[PDB]
Design a binder for this molecule. Structure first.
Ligand SMILES: CSc1nccnc1CC(=O)N1CCC[C@H](C(N)=O)C1
Ligand SMILES: [Zn+2]
Length: 139
């Protein structure tokens, strides 16, 4: 679990969104596993606007942050699950690192701010749904 709070927005994994998230929906993309909902309270996370390929992510299944090198946002095939059939997930970045299903929502950050959130994993790999292209999160 976990979310990004920026301005009057809350960014979560779309497969983990609540009824509240859906009742206050701003935008969602099943292909990116992202959903943004509106909040009344003001959020203070800074979104990075960069092409960084190194950062630190939070791994709740280990209660630790880990430094990682990660690939460029791209279309990566993701196995069928209880939330989605077998498909390509766009805007996904992979890194060698530990993750488990409860790890989705952990933030990935570089020196510039929030890069994205844990969205996929398996076999010593961890996938992050990128948010740096969502320029509207700041306006
Ligand atoms: C950190 S998630 C994880 N980690 C290890 C093993 N398995 C997983 C599970 C996993 O990847 N998914 C299940 C939830 C929906 C995800 C998606 N974005 O389509 C795919
Ligand atoms: Zn950066």
């Amino acid at each position: 679990s976990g979310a990004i709070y920026v301005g009057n927005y809350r960014v979560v994994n779309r497969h983990l969104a609540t009824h509240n998230d859906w009742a206050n929906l701003v935008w969602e993309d099943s292909s990116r596993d992202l959903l943004v909902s509106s909040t009344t309270a003001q959020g203070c996370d800074t979104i990075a606007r960069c092409d960084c390929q190194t950062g630190v992510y939070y791994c709740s299944s280990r209660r630790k942050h880990y430094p990682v090198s990660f690939s460029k946002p791209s279309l990566i095939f993701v196995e069928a699950s209880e939330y989605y059939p077998a498909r390509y997930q766009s805007h996904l970045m992979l890194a060698v690192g530990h993750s488990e299903p409860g790890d989705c929502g952990g933030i990935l950050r570089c020196q510039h701010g929030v890069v994205g959130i844990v969205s996929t994993g398996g076999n010593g790999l961890v996938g992050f749904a990128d948010v740096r292209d969502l320029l509207w999160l700041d306006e």
